[PDB]
């Protein structure tokens, strides 16, 4: 019904900052996007859609010092972020986390994402890498593990994929309602 906090998580280090200023729209082609502050709370209205959405990003255990309260939940809507390459985050995120953010609640909606996309690029990286070495794991690869439980959305951001996270903001008032 209000405006809600969102943080995200994933593997050691994702989407640092590129993923938080996703429907930014700042899209590569752009040099904006400074990363000296961090952001998670931005007020933007959609079509006559007045709420705000908080955003986290990288920080690994969220609360690195162990001396922080482990309990008391900051946020309602748990987004999941690894870097679509290197199976290191993908099987992770996915599969790590998964037990640790289950562990807060029982179930709750939960939003599949992805950072610095394809390797902060994916055209001029995917050609460099070597068809042999792509070994993409989004596609169909992220969606089988999606299926093996049941999270919410399906795709990716990064200063391009970000066309879901720039939609998303707008689903975000609907994790309001709950």
Request: charged content about 25%.
């Amino acid at each position: 019904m209000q405006t809600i906090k969102c943080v995200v998580v994933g593997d050691g280090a994702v989407g640092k900052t590129c993923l938080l200023i996703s429907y930014t729209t700042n899209k590569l082609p752009s040099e904006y996007v400074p990363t000296v502050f961090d952001n998670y709370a931005v007020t933007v209205m959609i079509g006559g859609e007045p709420y705000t959405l908080g955003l986290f990003d990288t920080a690994g255990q969220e609360d690195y010092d162990r001396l922080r309260p482990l309990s008391y939940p900051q946020t309602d809507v748990f987004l999941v972020c690894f870097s679509v390459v290197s199976p290191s985050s993908f099987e992770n995120v996915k599969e790590k986390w998964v037990p640790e953010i289950t562990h807060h609640c029982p179930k709750t909606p939960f939003l599949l994402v992805g950072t610095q996309i394809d390797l902060r690029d994916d055209p001029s990286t995917i050609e460099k890498l070597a068809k042999n070495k792509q070994k993409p794991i989004t596609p169909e690869t992220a969606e089988k593990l999606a299926r093996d439980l049941k999270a919410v959305k399906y795709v990716e951001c990064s200063a391009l994929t970000q066309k879901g996270l720039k939609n998303v903001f707008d689903e975000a008032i609907l994790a309001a309602l709950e």
